[PDB]
Structure 1
Amino acid sequence: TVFSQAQLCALKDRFQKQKYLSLQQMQELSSILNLSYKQVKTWFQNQRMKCKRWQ
């Protein structure tokens, strides 16, 4: 239920390139990292909610 440091890098890496992923893309990314899609899905949302200028 808690992301490893490498996983955080990988998610943070993509978010810097893409604030908005498609459902197919979030499924693809959750497979690589071995995390639930819901987990990946929530992560991006939480991430976007922190700043106005990422919305």
Structure 2
Amino acid sequence: GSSGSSGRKPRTIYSSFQLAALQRRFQKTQYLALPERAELAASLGLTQTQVKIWFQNKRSKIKKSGPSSG
């Protein structure tokens, strides 16, 4: 649109430690309650604004085929 979110780096947008728990939590449920979403931000050391976009984006890029659009 204006700036464009582009870039290439070996360090995934998220660390292995943060991801592990994240993905491990997502598989359980796509949505996270109040204290549930904060748990990842307080545990992984991230913020609700980060764990939120991570859970949302994923839903769109769900390795699993079916619900995703095309």
Q: TM-score range by the shorter chain?
A: 0.7 to 0.9
Report the counterpart of residue 47 of structure 2 in structure 1: 36
The one of the two structures with greater contact order (alpha-carbon pairs below 8 A, sep at least 6) is 1
* Structure 1 residue runs of 4 or more that deviate by more than 6 Å after TM superposition: none
Unaligned runs of 5+ in 1: none
Structure 2, gaps ≥5 residues long: 1-12
**TM superposition score normalised by structure 1:** 0.78
Q: Secondary structure at the match of 1:19?
A: coil
Q: TM-score, normalised by structure 2?
A: 0.64
Structure showing the higher helix proportion among its residues:
1
Whole-Å separation in 1 of the counterparts to 2:34 and 2:58: 16
Structure number with larger C-alpha Rg: 2
> Identity, % of aligned pairs?
48
CA RMSD of aligned residues (A): 1.5
Alignment check: 8 A CA contact 2:17 2:44 kept: no
